[PDB]
Amino acid sequence: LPTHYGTIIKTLRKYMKLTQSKLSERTGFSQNTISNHENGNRNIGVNEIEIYGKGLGIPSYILHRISDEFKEKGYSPTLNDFGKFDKMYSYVNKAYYNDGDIYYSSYDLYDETIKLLELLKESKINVNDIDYDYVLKLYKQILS
Amino acid sequence: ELPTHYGTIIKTLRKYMKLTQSKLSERTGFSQNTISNHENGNRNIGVNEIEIYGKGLGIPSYILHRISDEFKEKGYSPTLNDFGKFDKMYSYVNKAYYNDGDIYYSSYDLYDETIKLLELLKESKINVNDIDYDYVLKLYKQILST
Amino acid sequence: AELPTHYGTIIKTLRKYMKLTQSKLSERTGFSQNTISNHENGNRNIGVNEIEIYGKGLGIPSYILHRISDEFKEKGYSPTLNDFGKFDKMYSYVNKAYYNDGDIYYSSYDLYDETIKLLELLKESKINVNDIDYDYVLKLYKQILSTD
Amino acid sequence: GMQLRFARLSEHATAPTRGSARAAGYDLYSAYDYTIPPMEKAVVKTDIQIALPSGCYGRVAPRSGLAAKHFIDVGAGVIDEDYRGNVGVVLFNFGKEKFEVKKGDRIAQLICERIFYPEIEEVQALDDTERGSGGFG
Amino acid sequence: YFMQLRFARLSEHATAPTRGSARAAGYDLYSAYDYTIPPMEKAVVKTDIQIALPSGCYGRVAPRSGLAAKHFIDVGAGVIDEDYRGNVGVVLFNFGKEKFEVKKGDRIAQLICERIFYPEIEEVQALDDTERGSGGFG
Amino acid sequence: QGMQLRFARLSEHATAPTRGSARAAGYDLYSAYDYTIPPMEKAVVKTDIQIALPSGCYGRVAPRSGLAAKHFIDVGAGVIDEDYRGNVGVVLFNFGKEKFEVKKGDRIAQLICERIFYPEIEEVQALDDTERGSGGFG
């Protein structure tokens, strides 16, 4: 039942170092609205997540997938490590739009980001050190 | 070669839609004269005038064409005979097609399917006005299944 | 592409064929008489972007200049450029046929290659491209495409 | 572009039809009978020529019913705005059994797909885009 | 501020269409159900969503690149009219040698808002051949 | 000035896309390599070009009419997003009884600049049936 969108918005607003005032200027929601959204005093669905996504600078569907984790696990690993996710996703996103082997093989960028982070973790590799060109080779490997 | 019977079709449907030669002349931009020469006979009627009469009458142009072809093919139009029963049945079929996936992903032709349902209902002594959308929908799904 | 393009010769030969001066082509392309002279002489480099503009300036589809360049890379000379009058006439028929005949539209592989195959057939048969009826070309064209 | 002009090339043609003012395509009708065996194709003639409105091409597109019920599909489909020949529909029968077309059968739709006619430009290399790069924000 | 792509769930099995990037051609469509598609067979895969496309477009249900290139999956039909308000169905063709499994929540196609003209049909006795068709160069 | 389709060559093997006429729906795409497509098989055919589509369209990789009618060749996938800067591939399906040969320099498909919307998405509880989708004549 529960979405946890309130927590997701608060956490991502903080992750992107935005004041409620700034997110308000950008989204068109007042600070009172954003506070009630964040605190669970006002329901959040698809239509609010479209606005928040644009305001945060994070594709709306990622908030859907983070919400999906909470429901499927009790918490979101990705939200807990959003810094690692933002970094890997920037590489996955780039590979998808600039490499034919990815564009003609990829099934889902968010699931592939998660698969790659799990692979870096198991290999004891740090996502902020890895070479793009090496990420690309790991990516082609998980798709094949 | 064979005549279209468009004058008679237009007249019969104009009267059915309860519009005057003047109201149709309003909506179409054909002179109350031109309209009469078209119904009275001799003045001819192209697919291009039938597009204008369709919009004028508030009936899909293509149904005039399919009525005209009942005449060319069979010398009579069961649709133009009981047009009020055809309007009712068409409205249910049109609704089904645009609002139900089973029909949208199965229909071949909305007109032929209206006919085939009226014919199944005439041969059940069931009156169209005496049944409802959900009744028509069950039957429609049955005849589209193979 | 390693092999040179020979675009300088192609533009000079086609501009002359169209009975244009450096100056008139200059007015149409936007290239100065200096630039055009330097293209034709083979001094300045000529790529797809210049050929798009030269195409519009000459009233010749740009891709034909590409095709003519390919004749040099493959043969060391261009039969098309050597007898362009004939190519222009036969291409006008092939083009009209592609856009107006459903048998051609639903079978054609390449208008350029088919213009060449048709000109080869007329030379064999000693028929003049300037004299042949369109309705006869069309029968020749369907025959050439019948092979495949 | 408000006008789709057409002309009959034979007595066998049917005028294209559109039930609704906002249907995506005009219905196209076969002008002849054809028997398409399983796993074969055919070129179905309409015996109509068209003049598309300016700024579109004509896409010959599948009927949903023929696709979902009979495993019928449309290959080809691109009609250039300058094409004045006979409009042909390339039908693909991927079904287990033969597919019968009779004269006057509705076999496809014609959509006026709006498109650009862009000029071509070579560059030495294209930059990875601002959306095809960068982290969030 | 419209216009938009409106949709509604017909069941709890639906997934809200998703688009990874502001300029992706298509919205992602998700299966609401399990399906097994044997080799050289087809299936109508339900989304359990209904959509109201914006004005001046139809909805094209278009193939996924990876699904085609790796599993020989294709999309039949795919025309969705402005007035269609039924369950959005995807007609999947499996031209592969192996059966293709669809699970609830699998991405099986994309929805493209294809911009179109809705023109008026006009019969004419004969069209002329266009100038562009022939003439000579120059 | 005029809308530009920008491309760059990813190898010496690529051919610059071509258009016979100012109003052709598609630019011609060329194979950069030799392929042999067995009966009822597919192959990803590389052009070794990258493209920058103009704003407001996606690139549709669309079948050639001749190849369809004479050799039962079709195009799978075929959606190129505005942001795609990778090698443009053509997913060719050979549905023919005979194998289909691709040589380097062969025309295997056309690229159409399909105008689309990029709509915002809005969930509602239920879509009402349309006017044109309800009631009788009048």
Numbering used by the authors:
A (entry chain EEE): 10 to 153
B (entry chain CCC): 9 to 154
C (entry chain FFF): 8 to 155
D (entry chain AAA): 0 to 136
E (entry chain BBB): -3 to -2, 1 to 136
F (entry chain DDD): -1 to 136
Give verbatim lines from the article:
Stl, the master repressor of the Staphylococcus aureus pathogenicity islands (SaPIs), targets phage-encoded proteins to derepress and synchronize the SaPI and the helper phage life cycles. Our previous work has shown that the Stl repressor, an all-alpha helix protein, is a modular protein composed of an N-terminal domain with the characteristic helix-turn-helix (HTH) folding, which mediates DNA binding, followed by a middle and a C-terminal dimerization domain. Trimeric Duts show high sequence conservation at the residues that make up their active centers, which has been used to define five catalytic motifs (motifs I to V) that are the signature of this family of enzymes. For all these Dut-StlN-ter complexes, the Dut maintains its trimeric state and binds three independent Stl monomers, each of which uses predominantly its middle domain to interact with individual active centers of trimeric Dut.
The hDut-StlN-ter complex was crystallized in the space group P212121, and its asymmetric unit contains one trimer of hDut and three StlN-ter monomers, with a 1:1 assembly identical to both that which was observed in mDut-StlN-ter and that which was previously reported for the ϕ11Dut-StlN-ter complex. In the hDut-StlN-ter complex, the three Stl protomers are well defined with the exception of the 8 to 10 N-terminal residues for which, as in the case of the mDut-StlN-ter complex, no electron density is observable. Surprisingly, in the case of the hDut, the structure allows not only the trace of the main body of each Dut protomer but also the C-terminal motif V. This P-loop, unable to position over the active center occupied by the repressor, is projected toward the Stl and introduces its C-terminal end between the middle domain and the DBD of Stl. The Y116 side chain conformation in the hDut-StlN-ter is identical to that in the ϕ11Dut complex, although its placement is not restricted, because this Dut lacks motif VI. In the hDut-StlN-ter complex, all the Dut C-terminal tails are well ordered, showing a similar mechanism of Stl recognition and complex stabilization by introducing a conserved Phe from Dut motif V in the Stl interdomain hydrophobic pocket. However, C-terminal Dut tail binding is a consequence of the interaction of more than one residue, since the Stl repressor exploits residues from loop α4-α5 (G66, I67, and P68) and the helix α7 (Y98, S99, N102, K103, and N107) to interact with the main and side chains of different Dut motif V residues (D127, R130, G133, G134, and G136). On binding to Stl, the Dut C-terminal tail shows a totally different placement from that observed for nucleotide recognition. In order to allow this drastic change of the C-terminal tail direction, the flexibility provided by several Gly residues and the pivoting interactions of Arg130 at the beginning of the tail are fundamental.
